[PDB]
Amino acid sequence: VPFVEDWDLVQTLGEGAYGEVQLAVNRVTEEAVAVKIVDMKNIKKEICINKMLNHENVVKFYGHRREGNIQYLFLEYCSGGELFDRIEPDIGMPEPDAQRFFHQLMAGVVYLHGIGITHRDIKPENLLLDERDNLKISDFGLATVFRYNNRERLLNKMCGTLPYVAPELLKRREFHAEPVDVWSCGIVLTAMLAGELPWDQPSDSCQEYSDWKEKKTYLNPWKKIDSAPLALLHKILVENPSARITIPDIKKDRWYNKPLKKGAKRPRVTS
């Protein structure tokens, strides 16, 4: 087939630090993909990690091509955009939507952790939605290996996004990777259910974080959250990463297992 390798770049999906992500459509097949364009004038590790990833709740990597000093990563196109834009400021979203998105997030994060990868920057801006509203973890630019040859490596680089970062990343020289991603998921869950972030950062100097540790859940955002998901958040947003709930135990949580959402509305008729 002549021309199958030609993609037209038709729309900008986002500017970034690295550069820019474009929606690309195949000239022949009309298959759409996202093309991440990074001006090298870091990326080898992102590509390398991306080559490892194969999961329905993680953005698929198709390959890459370099043309001089410009790298082109070919990635799954997610037409639903960012989860961020499904969160209504000060409101959140319907609890059954949040639960479903949270289920899919855990699935992605379990997968990543199982192959020894930590994302390190989980937040609604990086969680994308496909045409069926399936959640996809995107952007492995900050990601790293925390397990190799069945041997865990402790992290020491501070990175991520302050409102989503776990307190230990600010307090300790070294920390385990997995509890940090769990914490960020908890912040994402809070945002989905309240449409606001609980604190600027999880530090002793942040009054809102102090209020949470003092269990003042009569305040916002917590007063907006039903008691069942709030009981889960109490187990996730635990300052001590060694006492913080793990994902296997999240999967056992009462709200996590609460029937809330009917299946995707399929067509039907009556007589």
Ligand SMILES: O=C(O)c1ccc(-c2cncc(-c3cccc(O)c3)n2)cc1
């Ligand atoms: O690896 C990355 O950094 C990356 C991977 C995929 C995308 C991607 C893939 N599909 C859609 C969108 C996107 C992002 C924001 C808004 C929007 O309408 C679409 N973004 C972006 C970055």
